[PDB]
Amino acid sequence: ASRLYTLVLVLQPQRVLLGMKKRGFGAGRWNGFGGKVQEGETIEDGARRELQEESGLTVDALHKVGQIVFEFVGEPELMDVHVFCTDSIQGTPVESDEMRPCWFQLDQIPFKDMWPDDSYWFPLLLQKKKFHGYFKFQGQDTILDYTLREVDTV
Numbered sequence: 001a002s003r004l005y006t007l008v009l010v011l012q013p014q015r016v017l018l019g020m021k022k023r024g025f026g027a028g029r030w031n032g033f034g035g036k037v038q039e040g041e042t043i044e045d046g047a048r049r050e051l052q053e054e055s056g057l058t059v060d061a062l063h064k065v066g067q068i069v070f071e072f073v074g075e076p077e078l079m080d081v082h083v084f085c086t087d088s089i090q091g092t093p094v095e096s097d098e099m100r101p102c103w104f105q106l107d108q109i110p111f112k113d114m115w116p117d118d119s120y121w122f123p124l125l126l127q128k129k130k131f132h133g134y135f136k137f138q139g140q141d142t143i144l145d146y147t148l149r150e151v152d153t154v
């Protein structure tokens with residue numbers, strides 16, 4: 001019982017693009033760009049589509065960097081998040097009713113205003129490591145337990 005999601009991080013040598021979600025699930029936290037994968041769509045095509053819908057950017061080749069499975073206690077569906085990065089985009093990040101984008105220097109990633117698991121795996125993404133993670137949450141703030149391991153093949 002799992003549902004597919006994508007997450008794209010635009011990660012350049014000295015800065016990363018994040019978006020502040022304004023409403024809905026995850027609102028109030030900085031995040032990459034992503035969402036649910038659609039019927040008849042590959043995961044990578046879904047990742048590219050979500051980047052455009054949410055940020056206004058067009059991506060040239062996505063790299064698989066991780067997979068994170070989220071369990072929220074008391075919710076039946078696990079969230080199977082496929083994480084991608086890119087360093088080459090076209091377009092200017094667009095603020096909309098759903099998302100406020102901002103570039104961050106790597107030393108200033110706003111972990112206090114992100115989902116708490118990001119503090120664990122974002123540093124691997126910054127060092128160009130690939131990973132498989134699992135995080136069990138109670139509510140949206142408490143990690144009850146987790147696993148996180150580096151892998152050679154996502």
Ligand SMILES: Nc1nc2nccc(-c3ccncc3F)c2[nH]1
Pocket residue numbers: 005007025026031032035070079081115116117118
């Ligand atoms: N960067 C990041 N960390 C997260 N932690 C827990 C959940 C989610 C999440 C957000 C939106 N849709 C699905 C999800 F699984 C996270 N996204």
